Amino acid sequence: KAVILDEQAIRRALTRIAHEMIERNKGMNNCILVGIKTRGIYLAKRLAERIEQIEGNPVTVGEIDITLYDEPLVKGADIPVDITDQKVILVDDVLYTGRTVRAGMDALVDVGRPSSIQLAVLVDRGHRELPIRADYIGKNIPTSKSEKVMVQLDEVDQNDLVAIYEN
């Protein structure tokens, strides 16, 4: 095991993402953050919080609970608003093959009809297996196929960190 991002690195990446979201989406007016995977949901909440303290406007947060690693399956969803004709940004903790994002994207296209969907990820470890790319990245991390990258957030786990494992 090895730590690649610590709490400070994660906080800086998130502050950078929040700003980029605000800069490229007209202050995030009418944009919905939708987290996928457990930690993606927590990151979406952190981003909404950061954006609100800057915009003075709350940002709607939704979620899709999916079995992560095209086997990943959408067991449900919970988006407090109608997303029809709204810009949605999926928030993922670690972008890898892209297969969870595809399952999450399919669900959104069937829960509502958003005008568009973007992708923000804390870490992109490469090795996609689908033509899906992140629009916002906290940190690109070069990995081999056998490595595993894992994010720990303090509202779920013990600490805020990103670790990489061999095997």
Added chain:
Amino acid sequence: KAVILDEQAIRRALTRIAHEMIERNKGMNNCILVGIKTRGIYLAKRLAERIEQIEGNPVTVGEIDITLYREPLVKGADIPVDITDQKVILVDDVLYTGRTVRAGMDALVDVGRPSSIQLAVLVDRGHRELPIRADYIGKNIPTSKSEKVMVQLDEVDQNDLVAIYEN
């Protein structure tokens, strides 16, 4: 109406794509080209032909006939081989919103279970509405939202050309 690419421009872009496919996919050994949309199917056949005349090995071509967005409904596929564990490359004529590619991608993850899916497009006009990007592009063409870009191939139309229309 205005012509942005002529027969020669189309031919050069395709030769460039065929080479990139060969260079990035070990000579295209075991890679399947799958066309989407009428002209995507024809371009896939042209690329398979170019790759064969360079590699001396045939390239399997498949197809998904979906209608271009304005969600795109899949009428069905037709892939002469079992694509399970095989690298697939979708071939599109014009990449725009990405919504036809999404419908085509979903199908592929149901007819078979390819190890990966990449995307080759003759023209990318921008304005995606999904986090889908092309891995091979013949020509990037900057457009406004109201413009329409259309590919014409001689197998189905009068000439080989790409035109742009205002609205």
